[PDB]
From a paper:
The biocatalytic reduction of the oxime moiety to the corresponding amine group has only recently been found to be a promiscuous activity of ene-reductases transforming α-oximo β-keto esters. By studying the crystal structures of enzyme oxime complexes, analyzing molecular dynamics simulations, and investigating biocatalytic cascades and possible intermediates, we obtained evidence that the reaction proceeds via an imine intermediate and not via the hydroxylamine intermediate. To gain more insight into the reaction pathway, we determined the crystal structures of the two enzymes OPR3 and XenA in complex with the oxime substrates 1a–c, either by co-crystallization or by soaking. All the crystal structures obtained had a high resolution (1.9–1.35 Å) and showed clear electron density features for the oximes.
In general, XenA structures showed a better-defined electron density for the substrate when prepared by soaking, while for OPR3, clearer results were obtained by co-crystallization. As an additional aspect of the crystallographic study, the structure of XenA with 1b might explain why only XenA efficiently transformed substrate 1b, and OPR3 did not. A closer look to the active site of XenA revealed a pocket delimited by the residues A57, I66, H178, H181, and Y183, which is not present in other previously investigated enzymes. Therefore, the presence of this pocket in XenA might explain why it is the only enzyme able to reduce oxime 1b efficiently and why oximes with substituents larger than an ethyl group are not accepted as substrates. Remarkably, a non-canonical tyrosine residue was found to contribute to the catalytic activity of the ene-reductase OPR3, protonating the hydroxyl group of the oxime in the first reduction step. Comparison with the other previously investigated enzymes revealed that this tyrosine is structurally conserved, though in class I/II OYEs, it is located close to the C-terminus of the enzyme (Y370 in OPR3). For OPR3, a non-canonical tyrosine residue was suggested as potentially catalytically relevant for the transformation of oxime substrates.
Author numbering: 9 to 290, 296 to 385
The structure:
Amino acid sequence: NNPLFSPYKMGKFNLSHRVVLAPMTRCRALNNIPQAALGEYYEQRATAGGFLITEGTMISPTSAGFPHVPGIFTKEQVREWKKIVDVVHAKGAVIFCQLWHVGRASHEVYQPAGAAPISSTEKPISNRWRILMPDGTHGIYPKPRAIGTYEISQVVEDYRRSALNAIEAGFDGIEIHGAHGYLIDQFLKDGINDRTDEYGGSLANRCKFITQVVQAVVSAIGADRVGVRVSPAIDHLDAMDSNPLSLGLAVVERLNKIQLHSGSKLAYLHVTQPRYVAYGQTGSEEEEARLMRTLRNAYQGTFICSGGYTRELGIEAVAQGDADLVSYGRLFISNPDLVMRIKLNAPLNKYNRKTFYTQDPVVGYTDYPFLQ
Ligand SMILES: Cc1cc2nc3c(=O)[nH]c(=O)nc-3n(C[C@H](O)[C@H](O)[C@H](O)COP(=O)(O)O)c2cc1C
Ligand SMILES: CCOC(=O)/C(=N\O)C(=O)CC
């Protein structure tokens, strides 16, 4: 009776329900090494036939813009990820590793040798935004270094190698974080990308980087193990575009083309609701709904929606055909058994923003209780 619990074939993965763990940075992976705490956390939230997406994971030493976020670019990181994937698979869940490069959304403190973060541009995020520092204070986003096309090709290889490392750790697949003003989105958004070479200017040129990243990982591990996350309209880290809908449709067209040329469909397209922001709660609601349905209708495959969803809104999204899967973030922080609570329509427990990004392996992380 609940459409969130009708099964869904996500390529080769048979999911038993459509409630997805959205990718959430939590900063418990001390020194960028996956910790046992992550295993307990993902294990708590894993269900038989349920789909989990990990926190954004570094693809290279320049990828981070948060403290104690995990990487998957070293063999040490792969070894520790394997233990976490093992306990998630022990419960019959499917798990993808989100590959995350923040680009200009970093700080000297997070870069090797304190170097400038890399980006499409030299323009910094404005002082409207602040970066969380390792000591819990807020820092200023610095001026990034605009990389050339050889360096771009090396970042693409960082995605390729990290996708292979994810498969070696036992992940079922990876998600490309191409959203929220991070590195890929710094190429996509014409409010950021001021390049005059073949990666800037036109919409085709601005889409080159994400196309090359997706093509690289598809070639490496197979289309059916690759999800792609974008957010054509978002209020995060000055990632504006003059025509968000056309930008989204240009990206979708390239994903459709990659699928045709590879003869296989991606695992999914994951799109953030424009209402979702990092700095608080929640143009017009109809324009935002138009954008989501337009992208879904344009994409030849599985659509995951995310951002501000509740039990009722997730049911509606699946019932109306607005999405195939619904990913939940904050409610999954505070309800380890969110899937069961949604099935039972049991009351949900509140989440505590204060411990979203702290380092404690337990407090605010794995000590939210299950249903009594
Ligand atoms: C603490 C926190 C960390 C997040 N980290 C990521 C991330 O690393 N990568 C990403 O794509 N989205 C990230 N998100 C956005 C979520 O994936 C998800 O889309 C969002 O939380 C959905 O909205 P909801 O919290 O109302 O369910 C994060 C959200 C929160 C609250
Ligand atoms: C508001 C959209 O941005 C996000 O959700 C996000 N990463 O993708 C973060 O907040 C970094 C922790």
